[PDB]
Amino acid sequence: MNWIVATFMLMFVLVAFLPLVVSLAYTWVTNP
Amino acid sequence: PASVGGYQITCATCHNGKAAGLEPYPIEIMNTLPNDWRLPLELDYPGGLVVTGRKDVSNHEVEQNQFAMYHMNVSMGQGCTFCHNARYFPSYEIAQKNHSIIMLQMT
Amino acid sequence: AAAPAGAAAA
Amino acid sequence: DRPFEFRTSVVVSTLLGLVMALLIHFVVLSSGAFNWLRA
Amino acid sequence: DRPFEFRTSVVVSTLLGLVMALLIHFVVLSSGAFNWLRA
Amino acid sequence: DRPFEFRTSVVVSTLLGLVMALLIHFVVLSSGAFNWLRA
Amino acid sequence: DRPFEFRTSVVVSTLLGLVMALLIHFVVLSSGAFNWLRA
Amino acid sequence: DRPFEFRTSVVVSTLLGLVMALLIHFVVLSSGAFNWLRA
Amino acid sequence: RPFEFRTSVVVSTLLGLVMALLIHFVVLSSGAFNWLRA
Amino acid sequence: RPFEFRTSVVVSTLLGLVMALLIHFVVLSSGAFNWLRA
Amino acid sequence: DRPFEFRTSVVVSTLLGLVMALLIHFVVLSSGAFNWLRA
Amino acid sequence: RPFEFRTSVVVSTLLGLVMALLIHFVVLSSGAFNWLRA
Amino acid sequence: DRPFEFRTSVVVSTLLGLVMALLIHFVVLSSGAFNWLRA
Amino acid sequence: SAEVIPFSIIEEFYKRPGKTLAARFFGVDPFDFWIGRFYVGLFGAISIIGIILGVAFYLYEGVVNEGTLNILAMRIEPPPVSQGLNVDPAQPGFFWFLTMVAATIAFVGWLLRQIDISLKLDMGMEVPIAFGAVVSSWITLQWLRPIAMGAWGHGFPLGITHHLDWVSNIGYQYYNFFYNPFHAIGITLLFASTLFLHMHGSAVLSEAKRNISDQNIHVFWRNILGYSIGEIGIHRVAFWTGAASVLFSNLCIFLSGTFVKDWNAFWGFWDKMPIWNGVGQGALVA
Amino acid sequence: SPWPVWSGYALCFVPLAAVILGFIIAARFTDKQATSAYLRLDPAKAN
Amino acid sequence: QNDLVPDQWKPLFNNAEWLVHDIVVKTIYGGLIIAVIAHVLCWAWTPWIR
Amino acid sequence: QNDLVPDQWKPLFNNAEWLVHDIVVKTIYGGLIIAVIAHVLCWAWTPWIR
Amino acid sequence: QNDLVPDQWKPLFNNAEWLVHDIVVKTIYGGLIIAVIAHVLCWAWTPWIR
Amino acid sequence: QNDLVPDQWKPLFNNAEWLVHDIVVKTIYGGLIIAVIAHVLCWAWTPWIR
Amino acid sequence: PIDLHDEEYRDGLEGTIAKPPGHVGWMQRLLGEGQVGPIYVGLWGVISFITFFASAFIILVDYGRQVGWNPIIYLREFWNLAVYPPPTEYGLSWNVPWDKGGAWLAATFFLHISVLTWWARLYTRAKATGVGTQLAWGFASALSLYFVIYLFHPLALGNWSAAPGHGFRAILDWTNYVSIHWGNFYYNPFHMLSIFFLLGSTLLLAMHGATIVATSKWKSEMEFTEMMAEGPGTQRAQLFWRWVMGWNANSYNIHIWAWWFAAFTAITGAIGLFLSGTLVPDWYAWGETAKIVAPWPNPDWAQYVF
Ligand code: BCL
Ligand code: BCL
Ligand code: BCL
Ligand code: BCL
Ligand code: BCL
Ligand SMILES: CC[C@H]1c2cc3[nH]c4c(c3C)C(=O)[C@H](C(=O)OC)c4c3nc(cc4[nH]c(cc(n2)[C@@H]1C)c(C(C)=O)c4C)[C@@H](C)[C@@H]3CCC(=O)OC/C=C(\C)CCC[C@H](C)CCC[C@H](C)CCCC(C)C
Ligand SMILES: CCCCCC/C=C/CCCCCCCCCC(=O)O[C@H](COC(=O)CCCCCCCCCCCCCCC)COP(=O)(O)OC[C@@H](O)CO
Ligand SMILES: CCCCCC/C=C\CCCCCCCCCC(=O)O[C@H](COC(=O)CCCCCCCCCCCCCCC)COP(=O)(O)OC[C@@H](O)CO
Ligand code: HEC
Ligand SMILES: CCCCCCCCO[C@@H]1[C@@H](O)[C@H](O)[C@@H](CO)O[C@H]1O
Ligand SMILES: CCCCCCCCO[C@@H]1[C@@H](O)[C@H](O)[C@@H](CO)O[C@H]1O
Ligand SMILES: [Ca+2]
Ligand SMILES: [Mn+2]
Rounded CA separation T31/A27 (Å): 9
Q: CA-based angle Q28:Q30:Q35, to the nearest 5?
A: 90
Chains D and R touch (3+ CB pairs under 8 A): no
CB within 8 Å: R49 and F38: no
CA O34 to chain centre: 14
| Cβ atoms within 10 Å of B35's Cβ, excluding its own | 14
Is the beta carbon of O33 within 6 A of some atom in ligand 7? yes
CA separation for the pair J31, I36 (Å, rounded) = 6
Q: Residue P24: nearest ligand to its CA?
A: 2
- Residue E23 region, left (φ>0) first, then alpha (ψ -120 to 50), else beta? alpha
The answer to whether the Cα torsion of G3, G9, G12, G17 is positive or negative is positive
The neighbour count for residue G31, using CB atoms within 10 Å, is 19
Q: How far is the CA of E17 from the centre of ligand 3 (A)?
A: 18
CA distance N27 to N20: 10
CB-based burial, T224-233: b 16+ in 10 Å, e otherwise: bebbebbbbb
Question: Residue Q21, annotated ligand binder?
Answer: yes
Of N248, N123, N252, N112, the closest CA to residue N193 belongs to N248
The DSSP element (H or E) to which O40 belongs, if any, is: strand O38-41
DSSP track, chain H = --SS-HHHHHHHHHHHHHHHHHHHHHHHHHH--S--S--
Work out how many CB contacts closer than 8 A connect F with P. 10
Task: Assign J4 to helix, strand or coil.
Answer: coil
Q: What is the maximum span of chain L, computed from C-alpha positions, in angstroms?
A: 55
Instruction: Give the amino acid at G32.
Output: G
Residue E3 forms contact with D (CB below 8 Å): yes
Asked whether the beta carbons of G25 and F28 are under 8 A apart, the reply is no
Among T168, T176, T240, smallest CA distance to T208 is for T240
DSSP chain T: ---HHHHHS--SSSSEES-S-EE-HHHHHHTS--EE--EE--TTTHHHHHHHHHHHHHHHHHHHHHHTS-HHHHHHTGGG--B----TTS-S-S---GGGTHHHHHHHHHHHHHHHHHHHHHHHHHHHTT--SSHHHHHHHHHHHHHIIIIIHHHHHT-GGGSPPBSTTHHHHHHHHHHHHTS-GGG-HHHHHHHHHHHHHHHHHHHHHHHHHHTGGGTTT-TTTTTTSB-HHHHHHHHHHHHHHS----SSTHHHHHHHHHHHHHHHHHHHHHHHHHT-S-HHHHHHHTT-S----S--GGGG--
CB within 8 Å: N254 and A9? yes
The 3-state DSSP composition of chain J as helix, strand, coil percent (nearest 5) reads 70, 0, 30
Question: DSSP code of N43?
Answer: T
**Residues β-bridged to residue I37:** none
Q: Do the chains contact at T46 and L18, CB–CB below 8 Å? A: no
**Does residue Q27 sit at the R interface (CB-CB below 8 Å)?**
no
Å from CA of T295 to ligand 1 middle: 49
Contacts of T72 in chain M (CB under 8 A): 26, 29-30
The partner residue sitting opposite G7, judged by closest CB among H3, H32, H33, is: H3
O11 phi/psi in degrees, rounded to 5:
-100, -15
Quick check: N250 and A13 in contact, CB under 8 A?
yes
Q: Distance of alpha carbon T121 from its chain centroid, rounded?
A: 17
N145 touches chain A (CB under 8 A): yes
- Beta strand segments in chain N, E: 2-5, 33-35, 38-40
- How far, in Å, is the centroid of ligand 4 from the Cα of R34? 10
CB N224 within 8 A of CB T121: yes
User: What is the crossing angle of helices T254-278 and T189-214, to 10°?
Assistant: 160
Residue N46 near residue N88 (C-beta atoms within 8 A):
no
Annotated binding site of N: 114, 163, 183, 200, 235
Indicate which residue's Cα is closest to atom 47 of ligand 2.
P30
CB–CB contacts below 8 A, I to N: 20
Tell me the DSSP string of N45-111: HHHHHHHHHHHHHHHHHHHTTT----GGG-------GGGTT---TTSTTHHHHHHHHHHHHHHHHHH
Whether the CB-CB separation of E21 and O12 falls below 8 Å is answered with no
Q: Integer distance in angstroms from the first to the last C-alpha of chain C?
A: 5
Q: Are E32 and O1 spatial neighbours (Cβ–Cβ below 8 Å)?
A: yes
Helix H, strand E, coil C: the string for chain B is CHHHCCCCCCCCCCCCCCCCCCCCCCHHHCCCCCCCCCCCCCCCCCCCCCCCCCCCCCHHHHHHHHHHHHHHHHCCCCCHHHCCECCECCCCCCHHHHHHHHHHHHC
Say whether the peptide bond before residue T20 is cis (omega within 30 degrees of 0): no
Which helix (H) or strand (E) element contains residue R42?
Answer: helix R15-45
- Cα-based distances in Å from T79 to L35, M8, N267, N269, T99: 37, 33, 12, 14, 19
Q: Distance between CA P21 and CA N28 in Å, rounded?
A: 60
Task: Give the distance from residue M4's alpha carbon to the nearest chain N alpha carbon, in angstroms.
Answer: 29
Which amino acid, O3?
W
Q: Which ligand is nearest to the CA of T222?
A: 13
Q: Which resolution, in Å, applies to this structure?
A: 2.9
N34 pairs with which residues across the strands? N39
Contacts of residue E17, defined as CB under 8 A and 6 or more positions apart, other chains included, come to none
- CA–CA dist T55, T108 (Å, integer): 7
CA N263 to chain CA mean position, Å:
24
The whole-angstrom separation of Cα H19 and Cα N46 is 11
Q: Evaluate whether T183 touches B91 at the Cβ level (below 8 Å).
A: no
Q: Which of F3, F31, F33 is facing E10, going by the closest CB pair?
A: F3
Ligand nearest to the CA of B21: 9
Residue B81 in contact with residue N173, Cβ under 8 Å? yes
In terms of Cα–Cα distance, which of H38, F16, P35, H7 is closest to N35? Answer: H7
Which of 208-227 (T) contact N at CB < 8 A? 208-217, 221-225, 227
Technique used to solve these coordinates? cryo-EM
| F10 part of contact set with chain Q, CB < 8 Å | yes
The conformation of residue K21, written as its DSSP 8-state character, comes to H
Q: In whole angstroms, what is the distance from residue N42 CA to residue N116 CA?
A: 9
The alpha carbon of residue F34 is apart from the nearest alpha carbon of chain N, in Å, by 17
| Contact by Cβ (8 Å): N241, N192 | yes
Tell me the pairing of strands O38-41 and T16-17: unpaired
Calpha distance T72→T75 (Å, rounded): 5
Contacts 24+ apart (CB under 8 A), S32-41: none
* T226 φ/ψ angles, rounded to the nearest 5 degrees: -80, -15
Phi-psi label, residue C9: left if phi above 0, alpha if psi -120 to 50, beta otherwise: beta
Query: Reduced to 3 states, what is the DSSP secondary structure of residue Q49?
Result: strand
N167 CA distance to ligand 12 middle (Å): 29
Ligand 6 and N155: CB distance under 6 A: no
The reply to whether P16 touches chain Q by the CB within 8 Å rule is yes
Closest CA to N95 of N57, N59, N64: N57
What residues does T16 pair with on adjacent strands?
Answer: T40
Q: Is B69 on the interface with T (CB under 8 A)?
A: no
CA distances from T270 to T143, T151, T264, T276 (A): 10, 12, 10, 10
- Contact of T13 with T40, CB cutoff 8 Å: no
Residues of T in contact with L30 (CB under 8 A): 98
Q: CB contacts < 8 Å between D and E, how many?
A: 14
> In angstroms, rounded to a whole number, what is the distance separating the alpha carbons of residues M1 and M5?
10
The residue nearest atom 50 of ligand 2, judged by CA position, is: P30
Q: Does E4 touch chain P (CB under 8 A)?
A: no
CA-to-CA separations, T229 to C1, F7, T232, T234, T253, in angstroms, rounded: 11, 32, 10, 10, 15
L-chain CB neighbours of T41 within 8 Å are: none
Distance CA N212, CA G37 (A): 73
Q: From N238, J38, M13, K21, select the one nearest T262 (Cα to Cα).
A: N238
Residue whose C-alpha is closest to residue N193's, from N163, N223, N234, N233: N234
Give CA–CA dist P14/E6, Å, rounded.
10
| N and H make contact (3+ CB pairs below 8 Å) | yes
Helix, strand and coil content of chain P, in percent to the nearest 5, comes to 70, 0, 30
Determine how many CB atoms are found less than 10 A away from the CB of residue G16: 11
Q: Which chains touch P (3 or more CB pairs under 8 A)?
A: D, E, F, Q
| CA N91 from centre of chain | 31
The answer to whether N216 and T4 are in contact (CB under 8 A) is: yes
User: How far apart, in whole angstroms, are the C-alpha atoms of residue N230 and residue T31?
Assistant: 7
Residues of Q with Cβ-Cβ distance to E37 under 8 angstroms: 48
- Does residue O14 line the site of ligand 7, with CB under 6 A? no
Amino acid at N12: E
Segment holding S36, helix H or strand E:
helix S15-45
Distance D31 CA to ligand 11 centre (A): 23
The rounded distance, in Å, linking the Cα atoms of T200 and T196 is: 6
Q: In angstroms, rounded to a whole number, what is the distance separating the alpha carbons of residues N90 and H32?
A: 8
SS3 O41: strand
Q: Whose CA is nearest to atom 15 of ligand 10?
A: N85
- Chains F vs D: touching, with 3+ CB pairs under 8 Å? no
Least Cα distance to F31 among N16, B40, O2, T92 occurs for: O2
Alpha-carbon distances, residue T50 vs L23, N187, T45, T119, T125 (angstroms) = 16, 30, 9, 15, 19
| L24 annotated as belonging to a binding site for a ligand | yes
Using CA atoms, how far residue T54 sits from C6, E6, L23, S24, T110, in Å, is 48, 57, 13, 83, 7
Helix, strand or coil for residue A31? coil
Residue to test with chain A: of T29, T31, T216, most A Cβ within 10 A: T29
Quick check: do F and T touch, 3+ CB pairs under 8 A?
no
Query: Sign of the C-alpha dihedral, residues O7, O9, O12, O18?
Result: negative
Using DSSP's 3-state secondary structure scheme, residue N26 falls into coil
- Judged by a CB distance cut-off of 8 A, whether residue H10 touches chain S is yes
Evaluate the omega torsion of the peptide bond into residue T184 and state whether it is cis, within 30 degrees of 0: no
L6 has a chain K CB within 8 A of its CB: yes
Which distant-in-sequence residues (6+ apart) come within 8 Å of B63 by Cβ? T173, T177
Which amino acid is present at N105? Answer: I
Task: Using the atom order of ligand 7, give the atom closest to the CA of residue T253.
Answer: 25
Residue N204 and residue T255 in contact, taking contact as beta carbons nearer than 8 Å: yes
